[PDB]
């Protein structure tokens, strides 16, 4: 006698390390304006959440089987729940058994695919079998699967073709404008030799292959010679690609002025410094289904380049908040020129990046609101519950 | 290497209870004259199992929840398999857990289908919707299906259609000769003794609860046609409604006022009396309307004792017509056809005791040549090499 929703994740404050533990935070945050909320996180304990712990006779055991004693414990915990919204394949399988033991709808939110992790030894494990089977098993039984966006629901259809396509939902990424804004410097810019006198063009990411960093230096030697390149650009994900990224660092460092690498993982402050000095950033994706640095980069009025895969379409308005280049991976070099173009246009123009970065904030907080992301949710939870 | 078998079970003794219980205990046991076997097994610690429990802190949750803690305990036991081979739902996600984690093939033995429980409101249950997934998990995904009957496979390739037909395949229940055997009399407390039937009279046996489906009412109506002699002996107990303990109670009374040799024995009765009885015995009738198995004619055959038995379910898979016994055809919409050829197919063997005599002989070769646990243990023995490979 009243909708009371489970929402499953792993992560939750205060052990939030990724974008699924962030989304999950500012979602619950807004969603428990609209109805009743309970958490159901892992980790330590906690007030305030459903703390799942995995199995103690299970200590030591394989990481993918302590995982599923934790989700038994998760899903004896959601009892109270009329609908179970579940994060990453760590809790599917908590949300698919509660959906079966207490006949209750199952929301899934498709934050990665375990069938397109790009390929490690890991993937040969036993725990990648298990993680590849929870994901299966919990999407194709899912009463919704919710998409960040157009681009990730084409990847999910793509990767689990048995889906219903009317069971997919496009419900956006949200970003919070009281924590993303336009900051004067405090600095990080002035402890990396930054002149604030001349443009500063910004990248914001990991370094892996998907990222497409290497793509931005390759474009950055046809860059106007006074402007700065920032790349806050470190873990890369596998030891090829940091020789790659710091072998063309160190080329384009020797053919041009202005280029700083940032390699440690920055706090927001220092993202937020760096994102509002910048004239443009930078998006250099080959693969980007969710591209929420976009957000950032925009929320911080700043106008962003980027490629045109996945979902930055659907954020980045092509000349009106930033420029979309094409991706084509059959000619990179025509990219790579492409990149240069639409920035060096920007830098030419600063009153037409000025007017991008101010519109980029303003369809920020038109349309990308938590506010209108949960209100969009609960709509989701009312045709699953109906 | 070598092969490694993770056999997987909720019973296992000192705790079994039910036929899917049984099968196991007796296959292992055969099994380790041929290959290495493990035995994961739940409920109370016992010596030489691995006794997979629910996590302590799940105590007091719904049964289907804490079943599948101890399948993630018995998954982290099995470590060592090189095949793992599941019974019951209970262990289904355990096997399918286990290959995937493992990399090792997952046998599974249909003993019951869940989707085929004839409905309890239990089947309202969420415990129901976790068990029905369990079970098309573990199946859908299996390396093999061993069906314990002809009428499993059917039931199986119909009520699981992803499951490729290839790895279906048909493995009985066995009989251990060595507890049912053709056996005496004997000196000390004789049961037949104790009841007062005559050695030297026919002597037709029913051993059964008094149910609908295992058809008593049919034997006590057939009776009526018996030559004047034969002796009906009723091991026949723990009616399951009020009006079939009225309807028996009324019909043997009846039979009893128009006939001398009937004897009701109604106390559940131990293995030694049971074998003395079937042993003795010219003719055991199973007169069952349903019998998925029919495993007590191979316990009659074993006692070297013709059978006469309906041609429902999997009898005719163990009672071979015109060798070890005889079919009677059984159609519920003439009952009194049925009742009348039971009575046929007694009074053949009664009128020629040589007959019943060969067929009980060809009955106990039948058990040792084809129903040995020795031979089911070698049958599923070639089902791992086969996976494995
Ligand atoms: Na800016
Ligand atoms: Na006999």
Redesign the interface.
Do not use: F, R
């Given at each position: 006698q009243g909708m009371r929703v489970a929402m499953m994740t792993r992560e939750y404050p205060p052990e939030v390390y990724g974008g699924a533990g962030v989304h999950v935070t500012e979602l619950v945050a807004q969603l428990r304006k609209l109805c009743d909320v309970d958490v159901h996180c892992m980790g330590a304990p906690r007030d305030g959440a459903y703390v799942a712990?995995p199995?103690?006779?299970?200590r030591g055991?394989?990481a993918?089987?302590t995982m599923?004693?934790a989700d038994?414990?998760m899903?004896?915990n959601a009892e109270a729940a009329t609908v179970v919204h579940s994060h990453t394949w760590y809790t599917g399988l908590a949300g698919h058994?509660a959906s079966?033991?207490?006949?209750v709808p199952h929301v899934l939110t498709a934050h990665s695919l375990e069938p397109l992790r790009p390929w490690k030894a890991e993937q040969l494990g036993?725990?990648y079998?298990?993680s590849s089977?929870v994901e299966r098993?919990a999407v194709e039984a899912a009463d919704a699967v919710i998409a960040v966006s157009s681009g990730m629901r084409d990847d999910v259809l793509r990767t689990y073709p048995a889906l219903d396509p009317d069971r997919v939902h496009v419900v956006r990424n949200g970003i919070d404008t009281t924590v993303w804004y336009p900051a004067e410097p405090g600095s990080v810019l002035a402890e990396l030799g930054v002149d604030l006198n001349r443009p500063i063009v910004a990248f914001v990411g990991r370094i892996t292959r998907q990222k497409g960093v290497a793509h931005l230096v390759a474009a950055a030697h046809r860059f106007a010679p006074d402007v700065q390149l920032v790349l806050c650009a470190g873990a890369p994900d596998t030891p090829q690609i940091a020789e790659e990224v710091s072998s063309a660092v160190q080329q384009l460092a020797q053919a041009r002025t202005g280029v700083f690498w940032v390699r440690e993982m920055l706090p927001t402050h220092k993202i937020r410094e760096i994102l509002s000095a910048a004239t443009v950033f930078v998006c250099p994706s080959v693969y980007e289904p969710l591209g929420i640095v976009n957000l950032e980069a925009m929320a911080c009025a700043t106008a962003v380049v980027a490629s045109d895969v996945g979902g930055i379409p659907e954020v980045v308005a092509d000349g009106r908040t930033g420029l979309l280049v094409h991706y084509d991976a059959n000619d990179t070099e025509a990219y790579e020129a492409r990149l240069a173009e639409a920035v060096n246009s920007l830098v030419a123009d600063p009153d037409r990046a000025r007017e991008y970065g101010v519109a980029g904030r303003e369809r920020c907080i038109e349309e990308f609101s938590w506010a209108h992301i949960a209100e969009q949710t609960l709509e989701i939870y009312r045709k699953v519950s109906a």
């Open positions: 712990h199995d103690p006779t299970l055991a394989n993918a089987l599923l004693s038994l414990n899903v004896n058994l079966l033991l207490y006949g036993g725990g079998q298990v089977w098993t």
